[PDB]
A paper describes a structure:
The aptamer exhibits promiscuity with respect to dye recognition, binding with nanomolar affinity to red fluorescence emitting DIR, as well as blue fluorescence emitting oxazole thiazole blue (OTB)5 dyes and their derivatives. Our structures reveal that the [name] aptamer adopts a tuning fork-like fold consisting of two short stem-loops and a proximal helix. Using Fab BL3-6 and its cognate RNA hairpin motif as a crystallization module, we crystallized and solved the crystal structures of both apo and ligand-bound forms of the [name] aptamer.
We also determined the crystal structure of the aptamer construct complexed with Fab BL3-6 in absence of fluorophore at 2 Å resolution. The apo form of the [name] aptamer adopts a highly similar architecture to its ligand-bound form, with the two loops L1 and L3 held together via the same hydrogen-bonding and stacking interactions. The two structures superimpose well (r.m.s. deviation 1.816 Å) with the exception of the aforementioned nucleotides at the end of the helix P1 that could not be modeled accurately and local changes in the ligand-binding site. The most prominent difference occurs at the apex nucleotide A40; relative to its position in the ligand-bound form, A40 rotates by 180° around the glycosidic bond in apo form and points upward in ca. 50° angle relative to the A40 plane of the ligand-bound form, making a hydrogen bond with the aptamer in the neighboring asymmetric unit. Nucleotide G39 in the apo form lays offset by 20° to that of the G39 plane in the OTB-bound form. Both loops L1 and L3 of the apo form are shifted toward stem P3 by 2.5 Å compared with the OTB-bound form. Ligand binding to this largely preorganized aptamer requires a simple rotation about the glycosidic bond of A40, and thus, likely imparts only a modest entropic penalty. In neither case did we observe crystals in the absence of Fab BL3-6, suggesting that the Fab facilitates crystal lattice formation.
Author numbering:
A (entry chain H): 4 to 139, 145 to 227
B (entry chain L): 2 to 145, 148 to 156, 158 to 201, 203 to 214
The structure:
Amino acid sequence: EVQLVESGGGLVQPGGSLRLSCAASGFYISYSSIHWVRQAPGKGLEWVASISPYSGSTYYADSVKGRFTISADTSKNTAYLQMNSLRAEDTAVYYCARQGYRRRSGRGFDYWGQGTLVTVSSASTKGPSVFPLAPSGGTAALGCLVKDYFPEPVTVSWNSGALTSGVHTFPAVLQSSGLYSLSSVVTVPSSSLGTQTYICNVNHKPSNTKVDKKVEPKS
Amino acid sequence: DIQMTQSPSSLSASVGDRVTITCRASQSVSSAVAWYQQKPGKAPKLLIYSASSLYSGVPSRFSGSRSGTDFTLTISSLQPEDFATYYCQQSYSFPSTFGQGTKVEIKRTVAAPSVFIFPPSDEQLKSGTASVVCLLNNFYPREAQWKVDNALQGNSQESVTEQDSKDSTYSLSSTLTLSKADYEKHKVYACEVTHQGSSPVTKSFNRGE
RNA sequence: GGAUGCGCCUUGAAAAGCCUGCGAAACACGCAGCUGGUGAAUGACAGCUAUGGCGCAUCC
Ligand SMILES: [Mg+2]
Ligand SMILES: [Mg+2]
């Protein structure tokens, strides 16, 4: 019933700016405190900013004061985070959160948005290069190498989502070159290598890329 | 500025176990402390508010306690759905601050990895670069070298998955990167794996096929 | 939404200040009465009303 839906993430260069929005449903933001919370990749939650009801008083983490401004458009039932002069360490998934009703959940944050990814980097939006990982006990491994894309994220499926069992898609790692790379693998019966076609489907929405790649034994 | 120091940082346990997580505020926070559960890729969920009150709808296995500036989250007996990262939070004063998290993982029996090695595709070869990939499949626990003609350590990067939901194992990839020049110069590409499983297993290919 | 009943809440402390409960409310703003208790400046309350808010049940 209660929902927070964030938008506005994406790729920005250092020194740049970005506005995140947080659209509420099922309650009116004017009666609650709204918070923004950050999670750097593989890191913990970091509180960023908040805005109080009735007064509109705003509060900010030291890391962020003077660069971020939290606000709210009550007529749109939406809160905003304006992020200026961004730094590389500001890279994180940004969450909207509602502080619950005092009598029902104290100061706990009872509802959270889905999160939007903000990456602050000089590197430029680039689709990936997808390379087969050719196969060859009684089971065989094969995969797809997804190299040199930016920024996150990329999604990988197999045979249009029909192949699921035994798939492992590893988390992206940032290579020295400043682009991402990640492999997705699957184990299958080796007896089926001659009779079943395996294609990995690689979508990179930042570049609007969609790739199908068939993986085959090499001669 | 108030700090929340949370321990343990990580924990392996089994279904039915009692787990306790503690968080110590550097100053008084007057039981303005909340606990959250977060699963990978998902938003945190509120468990406990006001140090000891059960948020509406979370199972009674979850409880919270305060002793002065010491706050404890207890899960009575672990369920399979309870493995996740947990966070404490103080909201007594601004700025709010979080504990750094406790990752609760499921304990299981040791399992050696199945190893596979993949040569660089020809399409990548004609591109200019050649990357060689070694796969460690379905092993436990997480802890785990490249040789191109017994040459210990281009450089390489590894990636590891989260615990598989089905069999609680991990998988890992290590990708070795060279220029096309240096790829077509040395005979055998070997991935040697060392684990809590027997004796250092090695897998290899030579560019002739 | 209207009728009826129930549950929780609707603060204690007084000049100011500080702290605490509440009002959809961490700041700013607002919070009735009587008894008894307490206050040579001290949160210390207990009982019962009034008013209002939310929820549950029930009737339209
Ligand atoms: Mg009174
Ligand atoms: Mg009273």
